[PDB]
Design a protein around this nucleic acid. Sequence first.
RNA 1: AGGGGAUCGAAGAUGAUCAGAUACCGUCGUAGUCUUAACCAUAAACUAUGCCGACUAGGGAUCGGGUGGUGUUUUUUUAAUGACCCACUCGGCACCUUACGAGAAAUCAAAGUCUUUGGGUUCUGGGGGGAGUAUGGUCGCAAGGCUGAAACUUAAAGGAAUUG
Lengths: 97, 202, 129, 87, 217, 96, 96, 25, 121
Amino acid sequence: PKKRASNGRNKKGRGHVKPVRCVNCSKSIPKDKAIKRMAIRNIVEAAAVRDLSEASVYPEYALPKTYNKLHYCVSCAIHARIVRVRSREDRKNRAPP
Amino acid sequence: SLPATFDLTPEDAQLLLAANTHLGARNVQVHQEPYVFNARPDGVHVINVGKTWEKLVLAARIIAAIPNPEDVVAISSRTFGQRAVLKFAAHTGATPIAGRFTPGSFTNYITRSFKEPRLVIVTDPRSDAQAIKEASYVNIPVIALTDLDSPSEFVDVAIPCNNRGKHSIGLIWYLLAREVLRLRGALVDRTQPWSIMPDLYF
Amino acid sequence: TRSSVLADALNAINNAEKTGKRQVLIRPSSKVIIKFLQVMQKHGYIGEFEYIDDHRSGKIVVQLNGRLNKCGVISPRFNVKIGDIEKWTANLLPARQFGYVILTTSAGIMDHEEARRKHVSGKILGFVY
Amino acid sequence: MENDKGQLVELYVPRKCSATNRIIKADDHASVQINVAKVDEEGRAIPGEYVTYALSGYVRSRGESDDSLNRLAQNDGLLKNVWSYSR
Amino acid sequence: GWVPVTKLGRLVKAGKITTIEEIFLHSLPVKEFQIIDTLLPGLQDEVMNIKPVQKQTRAGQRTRFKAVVVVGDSNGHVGLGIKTAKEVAGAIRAGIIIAKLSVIPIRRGYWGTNLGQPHSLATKTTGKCGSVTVRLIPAPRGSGIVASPAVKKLLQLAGVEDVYTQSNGKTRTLENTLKAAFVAIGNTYGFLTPNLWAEQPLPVSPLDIYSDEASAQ
Amino acid sequence: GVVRYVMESGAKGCEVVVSGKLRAARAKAMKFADGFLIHSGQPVNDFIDTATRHVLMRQGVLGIKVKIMRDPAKSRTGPKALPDAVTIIEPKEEEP
Amino acid sequence: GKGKPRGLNSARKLRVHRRNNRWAENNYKKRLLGTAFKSSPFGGSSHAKGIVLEKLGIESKQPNSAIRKCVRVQLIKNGKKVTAFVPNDGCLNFVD
Amino acid sequence: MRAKWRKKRTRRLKRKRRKVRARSK
Amino acid sequence: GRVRTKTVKRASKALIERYYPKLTLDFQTNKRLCDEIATIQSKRLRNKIAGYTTHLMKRIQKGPVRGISFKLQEEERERKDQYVPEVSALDLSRSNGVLNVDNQTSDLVKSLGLKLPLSVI
RNA sequence: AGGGGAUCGAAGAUGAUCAGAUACCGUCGUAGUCUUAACCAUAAACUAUGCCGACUAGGGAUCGGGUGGUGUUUUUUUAAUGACCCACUCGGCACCUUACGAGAAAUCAAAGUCUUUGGGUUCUGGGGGGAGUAUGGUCGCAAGGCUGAAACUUAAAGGAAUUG
Ligand SMILES: [Mg+2]
Ligand SMILES: [Mg+2]
Ligand SMILES: [Mg+2]
Ligand SMILES: [Mg+2]
Ligand SMILES: [Mg+2]
Ligand SMILES: [Mg+2]
Ligand SMILES: [Mg+2]
Ligand SMILES: [Mg+2]
Ligand SMILES: [Mg+2]
Ligand SMILES: [Mg+2]
Ligand SMILES: [Mg+2]
Ligand SMILES: [Mg+2]
Ligand SMILES: [Mg+2]
Ligand SMILES: [Mg+2]
Ligand SMILES: [Mg+2]
Ligand SMILES: [Mg+2]
Ligand SMILES: [Mg+2]
Ligand SMILES: [Mg+2]
Ligand SMILES: [Mg+2]
Ligand SMILES: [Mg+2]
Ligand SMILES: [Mg+2]
Ligand SMILES: [Mg+2]
Ligand SMILES: [Mg+2]
Ligand SMILES: [Mg+2]
Ligand SMILES: [Mg+2]
Ligand SMILES: [Mg+2]
Ligand SMILES: [Mg+2]
Ligand SMILES: [Mg+2]
Ligand SMILES: [Zn+2]
């Protein structure tokens, strides 16, 4: 029996999309099926900034973010925290957090 | 059938306009509503409150027809119209339901529950859908305070009012209260404002 | 493509009645839908209809009452000999007492009781009950 | 349904939806009969007279219960120009 | 004593309602059953089947018993009850009460020439349940009930004499074919024949005529 | 049958169990019950009386336990309610 | 539209497609191909005499265990050799 | 009995039948 | 460890509805009140109804607790009805006698009735 | 067959892991991966849903094109375009709600308008195996593709869902 109306995932109206490679796994996966997530974070973890505050010349220096977009195959995405099995009726939802 | 005692008096009119009972919803409005008058900028439709009043009269006339007016349930769960539903109840017979509907009321004949009305009025048909679903199991007519976006499903007479506002819900209940007794007893003098105040229903 | 205008017409009618509507517009109309509608009016499954003279093929608005169960076409238009009307009525019609399978004969388009008493037949058009 | 020698045979005889001339069958528990109290001089409820209206459960659930009630009611009086036969 | 609830249920022992056909006319929900015990008290009953069903449980094999039972006079009322319970006879008894609260009116008729005393069906009619279409077809007299024996018996209990039947689907699953036969005769009083075309006054409810006979003192 | 003689006699509840075979191959497990059976805590001593006797049927012996739940209210000795029970009253129609 | 043509003039394609599709019916296919003539140890007849070549024992399929007691026969009309069960208790002893 | 490979085998071991019916000339 | 069950919570509020006449914020007073009007079996049983009834009382002052009625909750909770009546009824007052309405909201008026305080936007 | 051959990498070579491990993992690495000129014709080539036509519910977005407005910015002074806004509409990718209808159910706006069975048409299926085998024909350089049985054997295989 058909589990999702999106079949695998989110492609209606083309026929063929193109493959991307899981960042953790290297497995081929169509772009529309990959599990995508942005690692928008500063180059500093918790604390370590006011341990660097007076460490810096340049009174006025902003904080540069480190940007990187990540694609997961289904299997990796499930095995990490990325997505989780959801109930039958819970699988129809597109709320991120 | 239709006398001019029940015409919309301009002093009655200023009651409705102060509440904004004539403001319909935005780009949302069920196809089953020609109760609309041509709409404003900023998206909001103006109800044709003449159609309100005529439906409200018929509402009243259907209620008065109920032989023993004790069994006429009137429902709110909506945070607002709870206060006004209880006031409406004591005036006529009018068994009330405020708070949560507790499903099993019209089916499921067990006590500490289970009115068996012959009519039912609802503040919000959307938010009181358990009663309107349940009523359609038991041959019970439904009267509803439909707004422009409100489901007409299983509702039998729609009162087009503005259900998304404080005073607008209370007004109709009191006007429906005033009308159902202007049909037998208290407030015999039509065109004579009822002793009672509308601001009580809030 | 449009192959039976009659079939498309009675489909709109049957779909109209089934949703509790009281009327339906039906493009594009013809000699033979009307006569069909007419034999349906004589026995009273609809009321007024108006032909609408557009200058191509004609819309039609028919007013329906609620007594209709089904009006359908039989396609293709089988040649039915007089003795075979008893066969079709048995299949298509809910009971002996009422309902009508309607034919087109050289004596015109008519229901089957008229056809039986006037005593002719020809091809078959449809049915109504 | 009478018979030969005219003596009627059918037990019971259903109502009919007012908006669809349909039939209301025994289990049609979405159907509802309406009573509008007919008024006279000063309303007075004319206790126990009514004008009567039946809606098939189907008409109720499709949403046309409300609007087919307005056309039904107004064409019988009961209502000013609230309904419009032309849309 | 019976001691009803249900504004209907009190109104029927008050004798203000005398025929079941007045409940049907107003299509009134019927939530008690002593009402129909009297309204028509000639109700026969055959249990059509008792059949084990199981629910697997950490120990295995619940095995409750299920009984399907049907009730009617041979005079145009049938009801059908499907109920299961732990002990065999407990399912039958509850099966009878629900067989009661279901009773439906069926519209008999003549095959051809309308003589006196109907024997057969108003029209062709069909009900379905699961895979099981069941078609009921008007028949000439002296033909009997040509049907499988579980339906021959139900149709006996709705007082029909001459009918043709034509099944389809998985009829070996008997619980369903009955359900479908029941939807079938249940549909006899839905078919708008020409001799029902006339407009009628809308008889006023017995919940309003004898409206005074609810509540308490 | 001899289950319900015990219930209209005025008991709060009653179980009858039988083990063995008359539908007779392997292992009866048949229960017959009604009412109420606090089982268990201390009220079992106070309010349930049980006795098992062994009936030797034709081709085996069958065990009938019976449990009876006397009405604790009319105990005529010791406690006259379960320690679950509570009760209260109010004043009559009074002066304002 | 239901898969097949309906026109008053499509008798050919209708008749010729039943002919095509009757072939997926085992009972039809076995008849038209005459495999009771070509195959089929008996001539397509109901019975056949034969000369008993030897008694013979065959173990049954499982769950069962037993020896079924067949004979081996050479059909007089055919040469073809076949095995045949001999019914009922004992009764193999009647076959020399 | 993965079909993909019940079917590789079915070919592996059917060209063999073809290539051995040609020895028999 | 210390979660009181419905035997106490039902019985403990079974009283407060019939005896808010009296009843105190002190435990040992209700302790010896309980067995006068109740039929508790054990002391620990009664001391736990009392400990909770007192607990409901030590909090009854500040807002009623869901599921209560004691002849005075009904009285005083009614007193806050009609806060605004005996002042402006929301007609031509809090307004300048005029009803402030918009261009199309207004056209709806000339349809049937005419007596109107006007405005535009 | 010529070009091209950075990368990845069937074979292969190796380091591990392993009871074994010419598997999974690690390092290599041939053909291949790209390309011109020829072949091949198949994929879970999938919406596992033929195409044409008609009709039957509620709702909000979006892509294209058009229509309308003293409408916002473009301020170039206002225009006029483009962008945007609101409203309509034809056409398209989809989606939400719901079934009134359908279905074995999962579900379905078609999978509806069917035992109340007929708008037109093309292809395919008839229990499971044996078998897409044998044979003939045909296409291919080949790998293989297209067409395609029978003996024989079997009481189930299977689909959807339920409880554990
Ligand atoms: Mg799966
Ligand atoms: Mg495309
Ligand atoms: Mg593809
Ligand atoms: Mg990036
Ligand atoms: Mg076990
Ligand atoms: Mg304990
Ligand atoms: Mg074939
Ligand atoms: Mg052949
Ligand atoms: Mg084949
Ligand atoms: Mg090369
Ligand atoms: Mg290379
Ligand atoms: Mg590498
Ligand atoms: Mg290797
Ligand atoms: Mg490797
Ligand atoms: Mg190459
Ligand atoms: Mg080619
Ligand atoms: Mg293929
Ligand atoms: Mg395919
Ligand atoms: Mg198809
Ligand atoms: Mg189409
Ligand atoms: Mg739509
Ligand atoms: Mg556009
Ligand atoms: Mg423009
Ligand atoms: Mg412009
Ligand atoms: Mg096969
Ligand atoms: Mg070949
Ligand atoms: Mg077997
Ligand atoms: Mg399965
Ligand atoms: Zn991965």
